[PDB]
Design a protein around this ligand. Structure first.
Ligand SMILES: CCCCCCCCCCCCCCCCCC(=O)OC[C@H](COP(=O)([O-])OCC(O)COP(=O)([O-])OC[C@@H](COC(=O)CCCCCCCCCCCCCCCCC)OC(=O)CCCCCCCCCCCCCCCCC)OC(=O)CCCCCCCCCCCCCCCCC
Ligand SMILES: CCCCCCCCCCCCCCCCCC(=O)OC[C@H](COP(=O)([O-])OCC(O)COP(=O)([O-])OC[C@@H](COC(=O)CCCCCCCCCCCCCCCCC)OC(=O)CCCCCCCCCCCCCCCCC)OC(=O)CCCCCCCCCCCCCCCCC
Ligand SMILES: CCCCCCCCCCCCCCCCCC(=O)OC[C@H](COP(=O)([O-])OCC[N+](C)(C)C)OC(=O)CCCCCCCCCCCCCCCCC
Ligand SMILES: CCCCCCCCCCCCCCCCCC(=O)OC[C@H](COP(=O)([O-])OCC[N+](C)(C)C)OC(=O)CCCCCCCCCCCCCCCCC
Ligand SMILES: CCCCCCCCCCCCCCCCCC(=O)OC[C@H](COP(=O)([O-])OCC[N+](C)(C)C)OC(=O)CCCCCCCCCCCCCCCCC
Ligand SMILES: CCCCCCCCCCCCCCCCCC(=O)OC[C@H](COP(=O)(O)OCCN)OC(=O)CCCCCCCCCCCCCCCCC
Ligand SMILES: CCCCCCCCCCCCCCCCCC(=O)OC[C@H](COP(=O)(O)OCCN)OC(=O)CCCCCCCCCCCCCCCCC
Ligand SMILES: CCCCCCCCCCCCCCCCCC(=O)OC[C@H](COP(=O)(O)OCCN)OC(=O)CCCCCCCCCCCCCCCCC
Ligand SMILES: CCCCCCCCCCCCCCCCCC(=O)OC[C@H](COP(=O)(O)OCCN)OC(=O)CCCCCCCCCCCCCCCCC
Ligand SMILES: CCCCCCCCCCCC(=O)OC[C@H](COP(=O)(O)OCC[N+](C)(C)C)OC(=O)CCCCCCCCCCC
Lengths: 316, 168, 347, 171, 96, 98, 83, 98
């Protein structure tokens, strides 16, 4: 039955990513005083399916890559890791109930930089490499704050278990005691996934690294990128917007937890439509000069606050 | 064949080492060292070390090895010896595997056994905690001296590297 | 380099060596070495030229490899004894790697090819640290694990060092290379007496540091790095040539100078153990060191080499170099033989 | 070396307590406040003898008290208890705080029918003392006599006889 | 709010930990009898397998001391089914 | 140590992790705590020259608990003998070993 | 008195983020020393029973060690139920 | 020892031989240097975990932190070598022969 469980997790993820493209195009449209896809199927419900077929029957380029083996390794790694980051998520019961699940997601997330770096090499273009280096430097810089912020929150939880975050928020959301950390966690997730106002890769007039890809290989990078947008917003809701779990009616948890995860995913689309784009030197200064000093200071505060109130959580 | 998972991983561990030890282009050499690192974590996980195994992914693979690949793509300007060394490495691995799987005893400097790694595992545990985790958390209660010297060295690493790279 | 950062880096070189000497755990010994190598590279790159960059690279690769072998010995020793204490190793294979790791760090032959080249590519002040201070940490560990060191290995490394230091020095005109080969030769003496009486290893180390520090200090005063440039000293600072003669004679072991004391005591502690062939061969091979020391005495103090016209402009200015502890070091390098029985303070 | 002595397959046989971990965890608190004396004697035996072959007879006594403990629940409070561990068994973590309502019924039932008082927070974790007639082992580690120390140096520290005596030095 | 709830969670952990303490004496007694039985079960098979070997002692200790030594996995499950051995070695590490 | 600063100042810098029978958090013992204790108490105070001869029995036991070399030889012998008799029809594993 | 106000009111205007960082870090170092509840953190940590409470052989002269868990002698967690 | 130790111990040997035989690139050898610490990391962790040496569970992390700090210092020298001769070839670093 476990094999059925894996497929009941993978296929719905891909379908959710497929229809996120539609929802993104329509929310952006109405914030721009237009409609978005409403011709391909009722209210554009067949638009995602048309786009998929079109890309997979379009001839791919595959230029004279310096390797031709990194060019095929990069999208496998991106999509393979993107699906792997879902297996420990409690919704409310994990597919894999890890003891160190929060640490597992950091570990797998830090490996996604290779697909950005490898695709830079494979393109064989000197300029495409520069774009890959800027993207890589952005991702590693902003996962410094992901690790420290996560550590600060877990000091009020007591473990790296993801399902213990549900117990921790059984009386109150962690957004209340730790809203300053939530702000810098939310922005740090935009920078990680190269989202506006942090999308210099897709931000033409300055550069992207996945420029030589077309057809199916391009869609694989796209699917992995959007599955990470949903996953990080599911992580945020679990971390800062805990949903009460009733063991007799687990579906009640899933409905409430999904609504929160959608509202946070739509917030990503909302923020894209509202602001201009950061300069490369300016998003680096937002991390090394503004977030990091506060994150380090709040880490000191959250190591000491539980001790001086007698509120250290249980180890188990 | 699932009882010898640790030995199978170790065999893949060695083959990766023969990969980048033969020194192909740095791009492929770093690729082979990532495979060995992942296999290396797999071995540590099956011995009960979960925090240590995951620390390999986060700090070694997702850390140092990213800096290695990052520096290679920017300062490396993207033969018979490589193939000769690579083939020589695999043959020695095959013979070492062949003999330890035939008579289950090999003597090369040390006396190695071939029964199986599972035979040395401890047979009793009923704790309400992770023994590995307790030891690592002791870094702050017992390892006061370790924390000071390690922290100072990391601080000096920042100072030293900026001095070296200024160039004037 | 900012002066404050220079002090901080130096204190970290000292802290690394001190951690090795006060540690009862192999992990802290290894940490001590790592902190020491990390801090000394910036003082080798301080002049920012290709030769310094090459010297720092050859040093990093050598010391990095040596530290990896040492950590392999510690782990093998943990597997076969289940402890980390800094004492005799409990596996012969651990002893070999440990003994070879320290030999590489010291610069003993045949792990010696980096000492002439690293010392040549760095300033005089950096060479003084490299040839005197950097030898304290490895010798401290040898002092503690000597009961388990393979006798044929330690005595074989000692003999090669004495020979290679002797022959290597004859074919040198650069001062920095001459001291480097001189340093290799004196290492063999320190490790030759180690199995028999470790006290004489410290005495020879202490005397070597005092004499070597005196030579580098006098070279730094006149900014001399070549044999010829040193031959103009008689026409600039006549007193400094008499001090160079006395120290060079001392380093060669000629009585009644201080440099005869360790060679004297090492020969004593080896004949008590019925070792007659080795001390004789060691003593005779040391005449090679006395030769290229004497060559510098002929071109510096005992003969007056040609001078240049612009030298007359130097006579109008004094010496503004620090020359710290030079009066005290030179006296200790020449006039300590009547105090030989004081070595008991090292026991 | 020697031959490892092992007890016979008939010396180990005993009536097992075949109830799942949920049943044990539901009765754990009352169980520890009723069978403390036979339990602590066995544990004192293990931490002192350091050999499971030396505490087999104490082990059987631990089993018998548990069987007798559960029979009393079987007689007086069966439905309340069967309904208590069914709720404990439902949760993956076997949480007490999810079944406070069913706990009260079982707790009250034993109080009236058997006069059992549930130990308070922090009672079962207290170090206690047990009176046992088993003699204290003398050499539990089976260690041999330690090698005798070196003779110690004692007396007066007088100056060296004629000094260092190093070659020709007279002091 | 966090201080209150965390404090209640520590009182719950002690209650859960004390239940384990109340059960350890029974579990320790069971484990001792299960370990000894498996050692004796292997002793019989060793005697049958090596009744005609040139100079073999059945159940000979490899330690000079006569102190009890905790068996390792090889000594308990030496001649048992692979599935049972697999569960007792990697079962915990592989659970979920 | 070359310099015994820790003993002079009475400060425990790195002696808490030297041996595996020292104080561990939550009193968690090592697998060979008893063997390490016995060897340490045998060789204490008599120098390493004597301990290499007068505490050899304890040391061999300690090294047997660390690498388990002798035990694996014994198990290996039994497995071969059973395998040899298995492929001759001369042996029959009992039901609870299968 | 006026020098500090001029200095504080300038960083608060030009560098509000850094002013917040140092204030927060400064409280993390000071409050634990002055907090009266820091002593209850140690007591809670010492009260958690990870290990088994090995019993002590009775010799006769041990009036402070209870013979049974429910006896009144020994440490009490009453303070914890009220905290 | 055991069967797994053979391959871990043989992986260190391969990396050591790889580090002692340079081909052309300096970056290639630094990888062989970081392969050596990976083998030492795994070998120590296997010993510590198996023996339940609780307080030594922190040692492999310290090994990783210092070995990575050393690796960073190695890459910095490689960069400064490349900014001079235009490549990271070891044959260029041959000025100090004379
Ligand atoms: C008995 C044993 C007796 C033997 C003792 C041997 C001592 C001889 C020292 C050499 C003489 C000094 C000299 O000529 O200057 C050379 C040189 C300056 O010449 P430079 O190259 O033109 O300038 C370098 C920079 O440009 C810097 O330029 P800057 O303008 O930026 O200035 C930075 C600042 C920096 O000022 C400092 O130097 C102070 C730094 C702190 C030193 C440690 C203090 C010890 C107390 C705390 C513990 O000022 C100076 O550099 C002053 C000039 C140096 C004179 C002071 C040297 C004091 C050494 C005596 C203490 C020996 C401790 C070991 C040395 C450290 C080992 C790595 O200074 C040195 O760096 C020499 C370092 C000494 C290494 C050898 C130490 C002996 C090892 C044996 C120790 C005993 C065990 C046996
Ligand atoms: C234990 C007792 C040890 C007594 C140490 C007291 C003297 C050390 C302070 C003297 C000093 O400033 O330079 C030391 C030290 C070395 O500088 P220096 O260039 O060798 O001193 C000679 C100058 O001409 C110095 O000429 P200056 O005009 O620059 O300064 C005149 C200096 C004159 O002070 C002196 O007398 C300098 C010479 C004193 C002896 C230096 C060696 C220290 C004693 C070593 C003992 C070796 C024992 C060997 C025994 C073997 C046989 C048993 O007067 C003072 O500074 C004394 C200030 C009192 C504090 O300077 C430093 O960097 C550290 C301060
Ligand atoms: C394959 C294709 C490439 C996969 C790349 C991603 C590697 C997966 C990460 C390893 C698994 C993990 O993180 O364990 C955490 C988790 C940590 O969980 P835990 O610490 O909570 O413990 C689980 C069990 N309890 C809680 C009861 C103790 O590991 C596990 O849960 C189970 C361990 C299974 C060990 C089997 C590993 C074999 C596979 C490793 C080889 C990977 C090769 C990589 C090739 C090179 C590419 C980088
Ligand atoms: C500023 C722009 C960016 C901001 C992003 C804002 C979007 C993120 C979501 C914010 C709104 C919070 C979700 C409200 C809808 C959730 C529906 C739901 O779960 O049930 C109501 C939930 C029900 O609560 P519950 O099921 O989540 O459990 C609460 C947990 N305890 C009991 C511990 C507090 O309550 C509400 O959210 C009412 C508002
Ligand atoms: C009693 C003890 C109490 C201890 C704690 C006390 C805390 C007191 C409050 C401290 C300040 C709170 C920290 C807030 C974070 C400040 C970060 C920062 O650097 O600010 C300056 C930074 C930049 O500041 P700057 O650019 O204006 O200038 C910095 C300083 N100079 C002038 C010198 C350059 O602001 C930003 O982060 C830019 C935002 C980028 C665009 C983000 C889009 C926002 C979309 C809305 C999202 C809403 C959040 C959704 C959260 C949902 C979560 C579920
Ligand atoms: C109420 C009372 C509250 C306490 C008083 C407030 C604190 C006073 C200090 C705040 C002022 C800091 C000094 C400053 O103004 O720095 C500004 C300067 C910015 O320079 P720059 O950005 O490069 O200029 C660009 C112009 N085009 O920046 C600099 O030049 C250097 C700034 C370095 C900042 C280091 C940040 C790391 C520290 C993070 C905080 C962690 C806590 C530190 C430990 C605290 C221990 C108690
Ligand atoms: C133990 C077993 C050790 C010996 C195994 C030999 C494995 C190496 C195989 C030989 C080899 O590497 O190729 C030949 C070698 C270098 O390759 P080569 O073809 O010469 O490259 C430049 C040609 N223009 O050519 C050589 O220079 C010889 C190097 C020594 C071999
Ligand atoms: C392969 C052919 C071979 O067996 O060479 C073994 C040689 C001598 O070793 P020896 O123990 O005498 O051989 C056993 C004979 N019964 O010894 C060798 O040639 C083995 C070469 C090993 C090189 C060691 C380099 C330093 C690293 C030491 C760490 C330990 C590595 C050795 C143990 C793992 C086995 C690879
Ligand atoms: C006892 C245990 C704790 C011990 C901690 C000791 C280590 C502290 C580590 C702190 C982290 C390192 C930061 C140090 C750098 C300080 C900033 C600096 O470098 O100075 C730069 C600044 C430049 O000046 P400029 O830009 O030209 O003009 C405007 C300046 N305001 O020049 C300046 O004018 C800056 C002024 C100096 C900054 C002083 C910072 C003091 C922070 C302490 C605040 C604590 C208050 C806590 C109480 C809060 C109550 C609400
Ligand atoms: C050029 C080759 C270089 C070396 C790698 C060898 C690959 C091919 C296999 C040849 C050796 C051999 O006999 O393969 C077979 C071994 C099997 O080992 P096991 O699972 O522990 O079997 C022992 C358990 N029993 C008793 C049930 C069989 O395979 C490996 O261990 C995996 C090798 C990595 C792929």
């Amino acid at each position: 039955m476990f094999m059925i469980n894996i497929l009941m997790l993978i296929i719905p993820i891909l379908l959710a990513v497929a229809f996120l493209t539609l929802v993104e195009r329509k929310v952006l449209g109405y914030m721009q005083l237009r409609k978005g896809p409403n011709v391909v199927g009722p209210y554009g419900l067949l638009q995602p399916i048309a786009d998929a077929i079109k890309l997979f029957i379009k001839e791919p380029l595959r230029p004279a890559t310096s390797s031709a083996s990194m060019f095929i390794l990069a999208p496998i790694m991106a999509l393979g890791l993107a699906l792997t980051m879902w297996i420990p998520l409690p919704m409310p019961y994990p597919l894999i109930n890890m003891n160190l699940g929060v640490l597992f997601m950091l570990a797998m997330s830090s490996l996604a930089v290779y697909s950005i770096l490898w695709s830079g090499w494979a393109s064989n273009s000197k300029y495409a490499l520069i774009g890959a280096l800027r993207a890589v430097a952005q991702t590693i810089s902003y996962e410094v704050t992901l690790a420290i912020i996560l550590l600060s929150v877990l000091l009020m939880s007591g473990s790296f278990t993801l399902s213990t975050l549900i117990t921790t928020q059984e009386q109150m959301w962690l957004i209340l005691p730790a809203w300053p950390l939530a702000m810098m966690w939310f922005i740090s997730t935009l920078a990680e996934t190269n989202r506006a106002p942090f999308d210099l890769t897709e931000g033409e007039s300055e550069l992207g690294f996945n420029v030589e890809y077309a057809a199916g290989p391009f869609a694989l990078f796209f699917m992995a990128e959007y599955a990470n947008i949903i996953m990080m917003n599911i992580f945020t809701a679990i971390l800062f917007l805990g949903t009460s779990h009733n063991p007799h009616m687990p579906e009640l948890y899933t409905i409430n937890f999904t609504i929160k995860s959608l509202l946070l995913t739509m917030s990503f689309l909302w923020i894209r439509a509202s602001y201009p784009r950061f300069r490369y030197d300016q998003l680096m200064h937002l991390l090394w000069k503004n977030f990091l000093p506060l994150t380090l200071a709040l880490c000191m505060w959250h190591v000491s606050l539980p001790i001086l109130t007698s509120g250290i959580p249980p180890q188990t | 064949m699932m009882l010898y998972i640790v030995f199978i991983l170790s065999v893949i561990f060695v083959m990766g080492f023969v990969g980048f030890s033969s020194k192909p282009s740095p791009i492929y050499g770093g690729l082979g060292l990532i495979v060995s690192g992942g296999v290396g974590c797999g071995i540590v996980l099956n011995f009960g070390g979960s925090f240590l195994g995951l620390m390999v992914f986060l700090i070694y693979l997702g850390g140092m090895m990213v800096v290695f690949g990052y520096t290679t793509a920017m300062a490396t300007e993207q033969n018979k010896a490589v193939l000769g060394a690579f083939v020589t490495g695999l043959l020695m691995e095959f013979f070492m595997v062949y003999y330890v799987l035939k008579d289950k005893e090999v003597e090369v400097v040390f006396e190695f056994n071939g029964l199986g790694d599972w035979v040395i595992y401890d047979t009793g545990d009923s704790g309400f905690f992770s023994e590995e985790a307790m030891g690592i958390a002791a870094l702050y209660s017992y390892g006061t001296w370790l924390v000071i010297v390690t922290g100072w060295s990391l601080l000096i690493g920042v100072v030293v590297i900026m001095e070296i790279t200024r160039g004037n | 380099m900012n002066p404050i950062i220079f002090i901080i880096i130096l204190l970290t070189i000292m802290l690394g060596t001190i951690i090795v000497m006060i540690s009862s755990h192999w992990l802290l010994v290894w940490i001590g070495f790592e902190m020491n190598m990390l801090a000394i590279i910036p003082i080798m790159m301080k002049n920012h030229n290709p030769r310094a960059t090459e010297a720092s690279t050859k040093y990093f690769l050598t010391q990095s490899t040596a530290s990896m072998l040492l950590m392999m010995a510690v782990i093998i020793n943990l597997m076969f004894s289940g402890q980390w204490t800094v004492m005799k190793l409990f596996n012969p294979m651990a002893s070999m790697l440990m003994t070879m790791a320290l030999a590489m760090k010291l610069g003993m032959a045949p792990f010696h090819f980096w000492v002439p080249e690293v010392t040549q590519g760095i300033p005089l002040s950096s060479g003084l640290i490299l040839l005197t201070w950097q030898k304290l940490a490895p010798m401290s560990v040898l002092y503690q694990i000597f009961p388990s060191i393979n006798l044929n290995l330690i005595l074989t490394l000692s003999v090669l060092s004495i020979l290679i230091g002797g022959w290597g020095g004859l074919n040198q005109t650069q001062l920095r290379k001459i001291m480097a080969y001189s340093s290799i030769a004196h290492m063999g003496w320190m490790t030759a007496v180690l199995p028999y009486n470790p006290t004489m290893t410290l005495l020879n180390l202490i005397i070597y540091i005092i004499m070597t520090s005196t030579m580098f200090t006098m070279f730094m005063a006149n900014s001399t790095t070549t044999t010829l440039s040193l031959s103009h000293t008689w026409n600039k600072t006549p007193i400094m040539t008499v001090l160079i003669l006395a120290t060079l004679l001392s380093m060669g072991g000629l009585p009644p100078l201080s440099g005869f004391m360790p060679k004297w005591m090492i020969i004593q502690e080896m004949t008590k153990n019925n070792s007659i062939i080795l001390p004789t061969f060691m003593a005779i091979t040391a005449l090679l060191n006395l030769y290229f020391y004497m060559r510098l005495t002929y071109s510096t103090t005992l003969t007056m080499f040609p001078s240049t016209n612009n030298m007359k402009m130097k006579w109008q200015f004094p010496l503004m170099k620090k020359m710290t502890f030079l009066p005290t070091m030179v006296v200790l390098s020449t006039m300590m033989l009547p105090l030989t029985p004081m070595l008991s303070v090292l026991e | 070396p020697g031959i490892v002595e092992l007890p016979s397959l008939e010396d180990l046989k005993v009536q097992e307590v075949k109830v799942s971990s949920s049943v044990l965890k539901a009765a754990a608190h009352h169980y520890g406040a009723q069978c403390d004396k036979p339990n602590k004697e066995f544990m004192l035996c293990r931490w002192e003898e350091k050999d499971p072959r030396r505490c087999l007879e104490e082990g059987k006594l631990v089993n018998q008290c548990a069987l007798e403990f559960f029979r009393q629940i079987k007689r007086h409070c069966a439905e309340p208890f069967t309904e208590y561990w069914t709720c404990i068994d439902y949760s993956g973590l076997q949480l007490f705080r999810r079944c406070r309502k069913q706990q009260a019924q079982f707790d009250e039932c034993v109080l009236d029918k058997l006069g059992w008082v549930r130990p308070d927070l922090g009672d079962l974790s207290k170090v206690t003392k047990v009176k046992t007639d088993r003699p204290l082992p003398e050499n539990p580690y089976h260690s041999r006599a330690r090698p005798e120390p070196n003779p110690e140096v004692e007396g007066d520290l007088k100056p060296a006889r004629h000094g260092s005596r190093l070659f020709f030095w007279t002091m | 709010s966090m201080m209150k709830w965390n404090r209640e969670r520590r009182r719950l952990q002690i209650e859960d930990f004390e239940a384990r303490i109340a059960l350890m004496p029974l579990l320790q007694a069971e484990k001792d009898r299960r370990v000894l039985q498996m050692l004796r079960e292997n002793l019989e098979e060793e005697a049958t397998v090596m009744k005609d070997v040139p100079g073999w002692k059945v159940g000979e200790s490899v330690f000079h001391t006569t102190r009890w030594v905790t068996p390792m996995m090889g000594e308990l499950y030496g001649l048992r089914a692979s599935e049972e051995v697999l569960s007792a070695t990697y079962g915990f590490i592989w659970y979920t | 140590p070359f310099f015994d600063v820790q003993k002079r100042l009475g400060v425990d810098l790195d002696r808490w992790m030297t041996i595996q029978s020292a104080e561990q958090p939550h009193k968690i013992p090592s697998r060979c705590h008893a063997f390490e204790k016995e060897w340490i108490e045998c060789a204490h105070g008599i120098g390493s020259i004597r301990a290499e001869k007068e505490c050899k029995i304890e040391f061999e036991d300690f090294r047997e608990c660390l690498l388990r070399q002798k035990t694996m030889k014994r198990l290996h012998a039994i497995r071969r003998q059973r395998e040899k008799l298995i492929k001759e029809g001369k042996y029959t594993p009992p039901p609870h070993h299968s | 008195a006026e020098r500090v106000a001029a200095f504080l009111k300038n960083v608060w205007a030009k560098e509000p983020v850094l002013v917040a960082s140092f204030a927060i870090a400064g409280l993390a170092v000071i409050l634990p020393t002055l907090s009266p509840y820091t002593k209850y953190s140690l007591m809670i940590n010492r009260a958690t029973p990870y290990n088994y409470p090995v019993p002590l052989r009775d010799d006769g002269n041990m009036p402070d060690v209870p013979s049974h868990p429910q006896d009144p002698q020994g440490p009490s967690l009453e303070w914890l139920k009220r905290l | 020892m055991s069967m797994v130790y053979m391959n871990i111990m043989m992986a260190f040997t391969v990396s050591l031989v790889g580090l002692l035989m340079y081909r052309s690139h300096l970056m290639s050898s630094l990888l062989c240097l970081e392969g050596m610490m990976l083998s030492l990391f795994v070998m120590a962790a296997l010993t510590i975990l198996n023996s339940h040496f609780t307080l030594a569970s922190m040692m492999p992390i310290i090994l990783l932190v210092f070995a990575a700090c050393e690796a960073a210092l190695g890459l910095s020298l490689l960069v400064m070598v490349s900014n001079t001769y235009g490549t990271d070839y070891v044959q260029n670093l041959n000025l100090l022969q004379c």
